Design a protein around this nucleic acid. Sequence first.
RNA 1: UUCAUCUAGACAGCCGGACGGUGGCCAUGGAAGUCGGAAUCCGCUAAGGAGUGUGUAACAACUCACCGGCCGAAUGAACUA
RNA 2: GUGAACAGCCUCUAGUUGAUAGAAUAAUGUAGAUAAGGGAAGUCGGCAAAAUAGAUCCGUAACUUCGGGAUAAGGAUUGGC
RNA 3: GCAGUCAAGCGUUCAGCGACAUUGCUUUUGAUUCUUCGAUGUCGGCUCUUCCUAUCAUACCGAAGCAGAAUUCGGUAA
RNA 4: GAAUGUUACCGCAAUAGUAAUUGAACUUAGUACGAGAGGAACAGUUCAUUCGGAUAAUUGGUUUUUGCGGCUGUCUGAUCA
Lengths: 69, 136, 244, 386, 42, 455, 42
Amino acid sequence: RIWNELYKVIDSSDVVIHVLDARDPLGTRCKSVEEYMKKETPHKHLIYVLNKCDLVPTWVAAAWVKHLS
Amino acid sequence: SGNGAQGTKFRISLGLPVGAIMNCADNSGARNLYIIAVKGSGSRLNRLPAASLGDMVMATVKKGKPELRKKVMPAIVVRQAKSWRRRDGVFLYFEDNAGVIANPKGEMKGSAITGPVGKECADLWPRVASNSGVVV
Amino acid sequence: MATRTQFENSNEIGVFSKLTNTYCLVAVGGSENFYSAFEAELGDAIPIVHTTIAGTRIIGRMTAGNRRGLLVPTQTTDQELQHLRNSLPDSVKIQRVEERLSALGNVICCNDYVALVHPDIDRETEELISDVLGVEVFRQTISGNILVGSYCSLSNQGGLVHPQTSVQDQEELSSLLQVPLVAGTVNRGSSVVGAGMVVNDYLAVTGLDTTAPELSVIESIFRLQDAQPESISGNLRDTLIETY
Amino acid sequence: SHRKYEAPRHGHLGFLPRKRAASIRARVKAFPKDDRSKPVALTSFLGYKAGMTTIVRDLDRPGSKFHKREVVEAVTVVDTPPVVVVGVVGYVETPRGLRSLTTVWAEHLSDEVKRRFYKNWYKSKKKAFTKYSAKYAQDGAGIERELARIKKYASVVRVLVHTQIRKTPLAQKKAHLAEIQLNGGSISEKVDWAREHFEKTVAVDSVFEQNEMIDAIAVTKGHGFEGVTHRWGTKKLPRKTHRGLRKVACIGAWHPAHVMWSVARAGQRGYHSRTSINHKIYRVGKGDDEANGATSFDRTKKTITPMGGFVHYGEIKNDFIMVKGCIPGNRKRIVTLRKSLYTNTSRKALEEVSLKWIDTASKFGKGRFQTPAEKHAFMGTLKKDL
Amino acid sequence: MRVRKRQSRRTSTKLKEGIKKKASAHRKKEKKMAKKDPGIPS
Amino acid sequence: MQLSWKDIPTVAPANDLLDIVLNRTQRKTPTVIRPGFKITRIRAFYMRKVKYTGEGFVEKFEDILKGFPNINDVHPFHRDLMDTLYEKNHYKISLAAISRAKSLVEQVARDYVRLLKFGQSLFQCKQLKRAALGRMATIVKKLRDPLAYLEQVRQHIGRLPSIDPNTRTLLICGYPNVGKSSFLRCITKSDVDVQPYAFTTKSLYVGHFDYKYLRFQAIDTPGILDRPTEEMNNIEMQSIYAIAHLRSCVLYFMDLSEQCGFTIEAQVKLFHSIKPLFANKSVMVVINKTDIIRPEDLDEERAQLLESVKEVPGVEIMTSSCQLEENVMEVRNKACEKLLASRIENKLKHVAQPQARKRTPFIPESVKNLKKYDPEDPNRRKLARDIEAENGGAGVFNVNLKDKYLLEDDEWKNDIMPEILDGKNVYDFLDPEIAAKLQALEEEEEKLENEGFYN
Amino acid sequence: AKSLRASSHLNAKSVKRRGVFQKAVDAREQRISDKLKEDLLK
RNA sequence: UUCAUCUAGACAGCCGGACGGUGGCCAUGGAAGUCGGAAUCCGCUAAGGAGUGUGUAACAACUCACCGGCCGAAUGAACUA
RNA sequence: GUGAACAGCCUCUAGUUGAUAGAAUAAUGUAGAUAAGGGAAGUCGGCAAAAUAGAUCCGUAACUUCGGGAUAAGGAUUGGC
RNA sequence: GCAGUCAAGCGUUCAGCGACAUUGCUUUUGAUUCUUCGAUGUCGGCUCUUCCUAUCAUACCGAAGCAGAAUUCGGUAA
RNA sequence: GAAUGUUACCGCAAUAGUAAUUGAACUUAGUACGAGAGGAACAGUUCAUUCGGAUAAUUGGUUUUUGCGGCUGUCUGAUCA
Ligand SMILES: [Mg+2]
């Protein structure tokens, strides 16, 4: 059900906004969905978002955004 | 009887249903064994499998060495704590039920067994008797 | 000499039998194949008695004795004691023992001259054992193994211990027992040497699973074969190195 | 719907209907095949269940884990005083089953069987078989003619016997009358043996012996109307279910619109005739043999009567049969001993028993002593003693 | 020995009418589809 | 796994496999559904049928894939044997085709289930189920040749030898019919043809023997010719790669007689050519059929070839004959000694003593005078086992333990202990010289009686 | 496992019956006949 | 119903031949007709097919298509109802 | 009187014997109970039962608006003379 | 499923129809599968009876490289 | 349960139902089979899972035998009861 809902929202969203945890954004990246988004639906922007930045050092978040941008 | 067990086993009271916890009776480091299944148990609707003295069961180590956690290993019951009719003409029971972890061949892991060992289990398991310092 | 034998389907010869220099005990379980197997080596030279202890076939572990006497646990019924005495000559002492422990065969490892006992064995039991068997008694453990009667085999010719015995422990125990000791395995790597076989000054019986190197090691250490009082063990060094 | 789960049914459909037995004394449905070569012998006997007791015996059974061991097991004690033949019945094989040809009585029926023919015995004038007994007059041709007729046509011969109720500690004075088939060849010899046994008594020792396998048939314990939960072992409902919880919740379905005979509903439990076979006889005690409860080991001058007497039974003074296990029917109930109907000499039966010790302690309460002498020796002298 | 069930031979006139209608349709279909010597014997 | 991969599950051809799967799907699953049933019921029924068919096909393919030894990264010797026998390229291609067919079946089943979940009519669902079944059938039919080839290769691999390269083993090399099969038969118990025709053994033969309590296995090979390896048969390549990969010590056999018409010069040339394979094997030369040649009666010019062979450091010459098998024992001992010495040398790359801290071993005179038992002697002992056999055998004969137990007089041997007497069991009171204690008690009673104790 | 209606088991049981099994019952009946005759002789 | 063989011995039953160039050409450890690839040429017959099948490492041997010898007369093949 | 208590029970003054009964104690029910070994493995779901319950003493955490948590929690006694 | 080849046969009067087979379809080196995309409608469970074989096991057999053990299919079998 | 002269006893059986099920311990066996790994089967025995029928020998549970003994409150003046 959860994966079906994910696919439904992906198909029903012109743009997809991906949230990430500042503690471990790379682990939460879940590249599996992103590959399908890039391949089947190029028009979907698939924009990242670094959430929970208030729970990490400012330099940590700055480095994360610099390396992921 | 199953593999490892030698000879036939006469039925006795089943005082260890699935999910029961019994104190470990071997020096392998385990504290208590949580029974998840009983080897050789019967199949019947709504009837929970139950073990008895001398029976081989699969149980997980609920407490003890971390290395023994999360894995289920075969075990042999050495004490039952439920009165059973001995053919000699006496009903006897142990202070507390206990078991010893063993391999499918019945070989003992611990080098020694603590506390009394039931006569039926010792007779049915040569390795248990060899590793048992006290019988009954 | 060393001969391969098996119980019904168990290689633990010492569990269901107890062989001494003057008498042998076997279980009554199943048939006389075990009795006939023992007869094929001993024949009628010494008594062979079918006997049970506490109504079990494990009399080997429950009882310990030598040429001078035999010891049985408190759980033994008077009928079994009387049958054993009548089947044995008066030269072999028989007496019941009363103590917390019951596995005399596993609690006591002894020969006709020296005896090993469990460290926690009571004073009265130790004195009774010494008086009955006419043997010296020492408190010892085989490299930390408290079950001296199960993990070690002893005889007037030699003794065998489980492979985990430390070299220093083996050296100390050999000097204490005044007999050679060798660390080996029986029944294809089984660590319970004292339960997997029985041995005396002139006969050794082991499980069928005993591989050829193990049988040769047993023969060399226990000095069964003629002109082989561990002398041929030197040649076995290369074979053991290649196998190990 | 396939029930999603296969499980065995509750109860045996072959024992239906689960109704009360026709009479207190169950009638034997079949008798052992007649061996023409064997001599004439009695195929069954009538006894009264005296009670139960504990027996310990060294078990001789090669291949068993209990070889040369004293296994304790339960046995049943049945009071079986000598029985007396008071007639014979001849049967002729007809295309519509065996048919009774004629019956002959031995000129003298005991008062016990006379009571059996009257309900109000005391009110009755006691006009007993006297008239038929007069058929044994000077010539007695009628009796001889009937015997010859039985010889000519009867295919099987069944003797009429009644238990000596007066020899039983039962409060009743009326005895039970039943037929017993006669085995052996020379059907003429059967009736000759019956005639020679007319008015004579036959002891159990001449019918059964130690180690002999027998089948016991008797009316089971009655319990009256019983719930389906215990009458069939039906699973109890969880709790406080509507219309109760100790009953079968589902009785039918859309089709068929009728309750099946196999739904195992509640009804009468017990008091049903049952047949139990392969009961091993352990002890055959003579009535006049003192120390009936003494084995070769105990050898103590004590009878098998438990201290204070059997619970709900008397002080057995005559021959009795001891058989292992249990037999259906309550104490004071008449139980018929029947042969195995076949060669049941399996090693279980071929093995010879040897009782090490016989339990004779009081079954009334937690009796600890076997005989009053032991109780006096243990407790010693009391205040009332001196 | 434990013979299984046997098919019933009853007419079941519902089947009579069904087969009659089916045959009537089939004859019409065949008719519509229709539009679209051995010499001396030995 | 290794060591006789005999437990591979048999695989039926494409037609048989498809028929079995279809029959199983038709039988196990229900087949009765009606148009009056709800569309959901029909959809569920057809989806269940398709899923069952797909699961059966997937299980079959997975079993076939798992059963095979996975030739890659098994062992150089076993891998090379499989490559030479089953054409490793073709074997891998066929197994990859089976794996691809499994994935195709999975994808087809999933797609058809997804399509059928939207079914709107009984006919549509039936057509979708039939389409899925037909797709699976076509995929299976495309697997015709690989399944047939894999059945044969599975049979062969199950029937192939199982040698342990890490163990100490012998290897026989030389021209065909030189006596390799005869030597293998004589040295160890094995079933090998010993006929004199060109290629007696078409594959490797294994035979086990024990020396000095150590397990040894001898390996016989068809042999090799003087070919430069540019052109060679799989039979010769098997022997070549067995020599190359195996640590076994190789013995080069030779026949100097007119038989084996490759002359002594040819044998020596073959030995020199194979020398590179002989570098680390600690080789030994065995001259067979010595009964008819006796190389001591050989020309010096011909013995020059033997000397040149001996020029190699680790080679040695041995003499043996098929009829005179006694030399087989000597050759076996020499080979075992060489192998053991080499292994002991490579490996490196004890008992206790009393020390004195009297006690001596004890043996009864009866044992010393006891005679050895002979199972085949008609006059041997009674064999209480045989006594039980003549009385009904095990489980029937009842052993009377009272027969042998010793008592002061056999006239009361078959007696019974009362064990009980109105309490205070007999065994408790059992003690010799009861008369003395009874007399003492009687004296005490006499004293009490005259003392007036009992008033 | 084999049921009572197993032909091989029934044949084995029949052979056993012809063995000492039936002889034991014959001896038991012979012994019982002596006591039956004694019941009248007394 | 339509085609075939037939006292110039019909079908089926028993015994003999089934040759010689020849072990025909490619590969071959072995490939003689019968593991595989192109040929599948010619002599004597009543007949022999570089071989219908079984089997040998290799032939060998057995056997078949046909023919020949014994009895004798209807028999065989494909279809329709 | 017991008892912290107008908490529960007995008795004293006073007021009642009024609820159709008799004979057994079948199944199934209404209300209240006991249980060998396992202790939620049953059920959608700890549904219902059970468990600690008063007094005295030791001692009492995270959080917090500093007021609370708190009888936190976790432990030892209770009779008579 | 669609698009093609062949015809054992049928046959506008024997051009057309057409059985069994057959080619294209939906990464060749067991490598991966980290797709798993809309059922507009319920299914799933406590007690309990019967019935079908399209047989999971027990019973009796045949065929499988069935040396044994062990495994596959098939015949009867509720 | 009336009715077949009445009561009582002993019976036959048309008909309806039916049942037992499976596993393992020896022997035969470390034997046929095997290069080794390993591992048969029948006959005789002995136990065991599930189901069915009985009975409390012995053990457990159940107590209105309220049978015995003890305990709190309260009442019979105290004790016993
Ligand atoms: Mg050869």
